[PDB]
Enzyme design. Structure first.
Site, mmCIF file in Angstrom:
data_model
loop_
_atom_site.group_PDB
_atom_site.id
_atom_site.type_symbol
_atom_site.label_atom_id
_atom_site.label_comp_id
_atom_site.label_asym_id
_atom_site.label_seq_id
_atom_site.Cartn_x
_atom_site.Cartn_y
_atom_site.Cartn_z
ATOM 1 N N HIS A 68 0.919 -1.287 0.039
ATOM 2 C CA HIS A 68 0.074 0.013 -0.101
ATOM 3 C C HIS A 68 0.775 1.136 0.020
ATOM 4 O O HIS A 68 0.554 2.318 -0.586
ATOM 5 C CB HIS A 68 -0.886 -0.077 1.489
ATOM 6 C CG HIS A 68 -1.828 1.195 1.326
ATOM 7 N ND1 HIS A 68 -3.250 1.222 1.308
ATOM 8 C CD2 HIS A 68 -1.406 2.387 1.610
ATOM 9 C CE1 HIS A 68 -3.691 2.306 1.376
ATOM 10 N NE2 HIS A 68 -2.720 2.976 1.710
ATOM 11 N N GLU A 69 1.825 1.255 0.858
ATOM 12 C CA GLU A 69 2.794 2.381 0.966
ATOM 13 C C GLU A 69 3.634 2.675 -0.256
ATOM 14 O O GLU A 69 3.735 3.582 -0.796
ATOM 15 C CB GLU A 69 3.594 2.392 2.233
ATOM 16 C CG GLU A 69 2.945 2.316 3.482
ATOM 17 C CD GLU A 69 1.735 3.158 3.670
ATOM 18 O OE1 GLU A 69 1.989 4.336 3.279
ATOM 19 O OE2 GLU A 69 0.701 2.775 4.587
ATOM 20 N N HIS A 116 1.655 4.164 -3.055
ATOM 21 C CA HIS A 116 1.569 5.520 -3.087
ATOM 22 C C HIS A 116 2.503 6.262 -3.894
ATOM 23 O O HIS A 116 2.538 7.166 -4.796
ATOM 24 C CB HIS A 116 1.476 6.245 -1.568
ATOM 25 C CG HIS A 116 0.208 6.190 -0.972
ATOM 26 N ND1 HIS A 116 -0.947 6.708 -1.519
ATOM 27 C CD2 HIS A 116 -0.028 5.434 0.264
ATOM 28 C CE1 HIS A 116 -2.052 6.186 -0.613
ATOM 29 N NE2 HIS A 116 -1.622 5.738 0.697
ATOM 30 N N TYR A 132 -4.357 14.172 -3.164
ATOM 31 C CA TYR A 132 -4.702 13.526 -1.856
ATOM 32 C C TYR A 132 -5.946 14.020 -1.046
ATOM 33 O O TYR A 132 -5.888 14.333 0.223
ATOM 34 C CB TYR A 132 -3.581 13.275 -0.872
ATOM 35 C CG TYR A 132 -3.676 11.934 -0.082
ATOM 36 C CD1 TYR A 132 -3.720 10.743 -0.608
ATOM 37 C CD2 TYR A 132 -3.795 12.200 1.333
ATOM 38 C CE1 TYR A 132 -3.885 9.830 0.389
ATOM 39 C CE2 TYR A 132 -3.891 11.229 2.303
ATOM 40 C CZ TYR A 132 -3.833 9.970 1.691
ATOM 41 O OH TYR A 132 -4.042 8.681 2.616
ATOM 42 N N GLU A 134 -6.110 6.460 -2.738
ATOM 43 C CA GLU A 134 -6.281 5.188 -1.619
ATOM 44 C C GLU A 134 -6.883 3.973 -2.019
ATOM 45 O O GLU A 134 -6.090 2.899 -1.594
ATOM 46 C CB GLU A 134 -7.252 5.791 -0.453
ATOM 47 C CG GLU A 134 -6.567 6.674 0.537
ATOM 48 C CD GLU A 134 -5.422 5.782 1.213
ATOM 49 O OE1 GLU A 134 -5.556 4.599 1.561
ATOM 50 O OE2 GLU A 134 -4.315 6.295 1.151
ATOM 51 N N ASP A 174 -10.400 13.294 7.257
ATOM 52 C CA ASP A 174 -9.897 12.323 6.631
ATOM 53 C C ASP A 174 -9.561 13.239 4.995
ATOM 54 O O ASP A 174 -9.831 12.367 4.178
ATOM 55 C CB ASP A 174 -10.454 11.224 6.697
ATOM 56 C CG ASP A 174 -9.854 9.955 5.665
ATOM 57 O OD1 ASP A 174 -8.714 9.958 5.819
ATOM 58 O OD2 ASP A 174 -10.459 9.169 5.318
ATOM 59 N N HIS A 224 -9.866 7.799 2.909
ATOM 60 C CA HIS A 224 -9.885 6.568 3.366
ATOM 61 C C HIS A 224 -11.386 5.822 3.559
ATOM 62 O O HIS A 224 -11.423 4.452 3.976
ATOM 63 C CB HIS A 224 -9.115 6.211 4.729
ATOM 64 C CG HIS A 224 -7.684 6.687 4.637
ATOM 65 N ND1 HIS A 224 -7.129 7.902 4.982
ATOM 66 C CD2 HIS A 224 -6.578 5.863 4.479
ATOM 67 C CE1 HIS A 224 -6.023 7.988 4.868
ATOM 68 N NE2 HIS A 224 -5.597 6.622 4.369
HETATM 69 C C1 LIG Z 1 -2.723 0.463 5.067
HETATM 70 C C2 LIG Z 1 -2.699 1.207 6.569
HETATM 71 C C3 LIG Z 1 -2.277 0.059 7.698
HETATM 72 C C4 LIG Z 1 -1.917 2.568 6.613
HETATM 73 C C5 LIG Z 1 -2.585 3.386 5.613
HETATM 74 N N1 LIG Z 1 -1.537 4.676 5.732
HETATM 75 P P1 LIG Z 1 -1.698 5.958 4.539
HETATM 76 O O1 LIG Z 1 -0.466 5.704 3.733
HETATM 77 O O2 LIG Z 1 -2.882 5.803 3.654
HETATM 78 C C6 LIG Z 1 -1.548 7.543 5.371
HETATM 79 N N2 LIG Z 1 -1.593 8.636 4.669
HETATM 80 C C7 LIG Z 1 -0.955 9.725 5.204
HETATM 81 O O3 LIG Z 1 -0.231 9.902 6.104
HETATM 82 O O4 LIG Z 1 -0.852 10.985 4.094
HETATM 83 C C8 LIG Z 1 -0.775 11.892 4.787
HETATM 84 C C9 LIG Z 1 0.698 12.602 4.161
HETATM 85 C C10 LIG Z 1 1.823 12.250 4.821
HETATM 86 C C11 LIG Z 1 3.018 12.589 4.352
HETATM 87 C C12 LIG Z 1 2.908 13.375 3.055
HETATM 88 C C13 LIG Z 1 2.017 13.722 2.399
HETATM 89 C C14 LIG Z 1 0.689 13.265 2.948
HETATM 90 C C15 LIG Z 1 -3.923 3.987 6.264
HETATM 91 O O5 LIG Z 1 -4.741 3.461 5.775
HETATM 92 N N3 LIG Z 1 -3.833 4.647 7.279
HETATM 93 C C16 LIG Z 1 -4.957 5.161 8.023
HETATM 94 C C17 LIG Z 1 -5.295 6.925 8.066
HETATM 95 O O6 LIG Z 1 -4.156 7.328 7.725
HETATM 96 O O7 LIG Z 1 -6.464 7.094 8.023
HETATM 97 C C18 LIG Z 1 -4.832 4.722 9.397
HETATM 98 C C19 LIG Z 1 -6.146 5.063 10.263
HETATM 99 C C20 LIG Z 1 -4.402 3.298 9.686
HETATM 100 ZN ZN LIG Z 2 -2.733 5.135 1.832
#
Ligand SMILES: CC(C)C[C@H](NP(=O)(O)CNC(=O)OCc1ccccc1)C(=O)N[C@H](C(=O)O)C(C)C
Ligand SMILES: [Zn+2]
Ligand SMILES: [Ca+2]
Ligand SMILES: [Ca+2]
Ligand SMILES: [Ca+2]
Ligand SMILES: [Ca+2]
Length: 316
Positions: free
Chosen positions: A142-143, A146, A157, A166, A226, A231
């Protein structure tokens, strides 16, 4: 660093033993030279300065508890690289074998993981909501996905483009999980989420509503939390992708499944040839239909199934 390629051994977050590609020069570093211009894993040491220190180990054995999140970030980055190269002929996230960098042990009790524009970053979790997040192959993929999105479609985003962003990460996270073929499913994060609760997950692609997410455009979130529900509304697209691959009847609309490999081909082509930074859900439907048309022909079952799936989730 400059050194010679070596092979270490250790245990991941879930207690499984695996071999990892390392580099020797005085210490053994988590630097895999066998893939592109390298995969590099770093220790953030419970702090938030990035990337931290390139992971160094005295003996090339990685069996300490502190080692586990690094072993998995490093190894699953390798699997994800292999998926993109072998399945889509894509060399790393930029298509030109860019070095892949990850940091683990980010912050304290950190219940998330992310791509920061330049690298992957993994929290250890608080031990209740999450265990170290690199333990999930779907999470690692997933990461890294991105990064692929940022280098290709560039989906902004927020709002609908952000929900597509997402969903793309959930879709390819899942396809990588199936590629590795260890306990694969259409759930997200099940291996690292809530160690005290069995059978749950962060999101479900097969039934997004199970974890409170919409499975039809009529149920889309339109508020500001969000990033406008990136998400949350991803559930609408995740459901469409699940239906394309596996089939089903959803709100009375039947979809003929065409399998994971074709789902992956169609969405990879959409991501890399048709989607733009501002694409909305309707535009994704058009991109997916065109992609299927390119690959399989306008009169194909594949095209018909893409249409059925988007119909089923209310996206015209
Ligand atoms: C597959 C998951 C375990 C991790 C996943 N992390 P993600 O990569 O989508 C988090 N996204 C994020 O931090 O974006 C903000 C950002 C961060 C850094 C630079 C630009 C924008 C997720 O669904 N995260 C959820 C969320 O952030 O809502 C959390 C609740 C686990
Ligand atoms: Zn993500
Ligand atoms: Ca060691
Ligand atoms: Ca699984
Ligand atoms: Ca999963
Ligand atoms: Ca759980």
């Amino acid at each position: 660093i400059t050194g010679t390629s070596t092979v270490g051994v250790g245990r991941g977050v879930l207690g499984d033993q695996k071999n990892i590609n390392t580099t020797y020069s005085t210490y053994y570093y988590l630097q895999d030279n066998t893939r592109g211009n390298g995969i590099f894993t770093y220790d953030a040491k419970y702090r938030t300065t990035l990337p931290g220190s390139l992971w160094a180990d005295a003996d090339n054995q990685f069996f300490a508890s502190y080692d586990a999140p690094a072993v998995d970030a490093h190894y699953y980055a390798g699997v994800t690289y292999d998926y993109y190269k072998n399945v889509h002929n894509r060399l790393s996230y930029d298509g030109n074998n860019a070095a892949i960098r990850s940091s683990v042990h980010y912050s304290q009790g950190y219940n998330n993981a992310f791509w920061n524009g330049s690298q992957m970053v993994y929290g250890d979790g608080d031990g209740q909501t999450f265990i170290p997040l690199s333990g999930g192959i779907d999470v690692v993929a997933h990461e890294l996905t991105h990064a692929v999105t940022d280098y290709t479609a560039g989906l902004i985003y927020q709002n609908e483009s952000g929900a597509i962003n997402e969903a793309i990460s959930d879709i390819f996270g899942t396809l990588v999980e199936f590629y590795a073929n260890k306990n694969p499913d259409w759930e997200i994060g099940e291996d690292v989420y809530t160690p005290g609760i069995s059978g749950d997950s962060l999101r479900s692609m097969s039934d997004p509503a199970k974890y409170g997410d919409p499975d039809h455009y009529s149920k889309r979130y339109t508020g500001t939390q969000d990033n406008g529900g990136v998400h949350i509304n991803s559930g609408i697209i995740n459901k469409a992708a699940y239906l394309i691959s596996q089939g089903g009847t959803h709100y009375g609309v039947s979809v003929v499944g065409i399998g994971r490999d074709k789902l992956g081909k169609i969405f990879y082509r959409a991501l890399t040839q048709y989607l733009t930074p501002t694409s909305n859900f309707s535009q994704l439907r058009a991109a997916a239909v065109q992609s299927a048309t390119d690959l399989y022909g306008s009169t194909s079952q594949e095209v018909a199934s893409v249409k059925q799936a988007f119909d089923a989730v209310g996206v015209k």
